[PDB]
Ligand binder design. Structure first.
Ligand SMILES: c1ccc2[nH]c(-n3ccnc3)nc2c1
Length: 273
């Protein structure tokens, strides 16, 4: 009633998102039409503000529906990558975006909040050269496997903030190469695409891996490929960072804060797109 619905923007996992105009304020919002527990969890997230997190303005539980009102941004990184496919994204911009996303995650993580589901369609950009995480924390409260960390794929229930670093590493490589890193069409094909590139994990590189719920002794045993073949022509700093983001063991995987001190971001700027 309070919002004139402008355009179906899309259709996430959680229901319809419309661009809509508040009538009592005139403001344009993204309006997402979606349990007592889910609504509390969602409301906690109104308190989670950072310039690289898309703002959740409101949560309206009414006529027993859930409406989430978010700040609106005109573009998403997926759509930006598709239109830069023949020229690519320049590296200072890739480097700026990665840095901002990492700031975003480091904030959220320091508050024990995870995203759990990062992907290019969740990363929104403005004309100012800001990139922001959208749908953050919505997974806990209430489809692409390509960004999914191996601990999740191997059936871990109690996964950590490292799952978001894994996802961001995947998106980073994709920005650079203009092709998804691990484009799996099932859970097992997803795991096996990761294994063909990074090697089948064992107790050497990942202590405890063999006792994970969906780990099978019968997994084919691939060797690790060189990262220079995976993300050419990213430089040595970039490759060093990327490999730390894609460590198998979630405990050895670089944290968002430690990644902000990496020499890849020595010379980081904020270019406009
Ligand atoms: C807030 C939340 C989700 C949103 N999704 C978009 N979007 C997707 C494609 N073009 C724009 N803007 C949003 C703003």
């Amino acid at each position: 009633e309070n919002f004139q619905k402008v355009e179906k923007i899309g259709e996430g996992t959680y229901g319809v998102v419309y661009k809509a105009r508040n009538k009592l304020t005139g403001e344009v919002v993204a309006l997402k039409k979606i349990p007592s527990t889910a609504i509390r969890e969602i409301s906690l997230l109104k308190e989670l503000n950072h310039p690289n997190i898309v703002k959740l303005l409101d949560v309206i539980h009414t006529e027993n529906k859930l409406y989430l009102v978010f700040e609106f941004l005109h573009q998403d990184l997926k759509k930006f990558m598709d239109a830069s496919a023949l020229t690519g994204i320049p590296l200072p911009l890739i480097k700026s975006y990665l840095f901002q996303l990492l700031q975003g995650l480091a904030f959220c993580h320091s508050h024990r909040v995870l995203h759990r589901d990062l992907k290019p369609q969740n990363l929104l950009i403005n004309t100012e050269g800001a990139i922001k995480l959208a749908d953050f924390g919505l997974a806990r409260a209430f489809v692409t496997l390509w960004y999914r960390a191996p601990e999740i794929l191997l059936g871990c229930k109690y996964y950590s903030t490292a799952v978001d670093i894994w996802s961001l590493g995947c998106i980073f490589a994709e920005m650079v190469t203009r092709r998804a890193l691990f484009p799996g069409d099932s859970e097992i094909d997803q795991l096996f695409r990761i294994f063909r590139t990074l090697g089948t994990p064992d107790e050497v590189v990942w202590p405890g891996v063999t006792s994970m719920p969906d780990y099978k002794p019968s997994f084919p045993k691939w060797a690790r490929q060189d990262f220079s073949k995976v993300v050419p022509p990213l430089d040595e700093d970039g490759r060093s960072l990327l490999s730390q983001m894609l460590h198998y063991d979630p405990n050895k995987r670089i944290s968002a804060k430690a990644a902000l001190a990496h020499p890849f971001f020595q010379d980081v700027t904020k270019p406009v797109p």
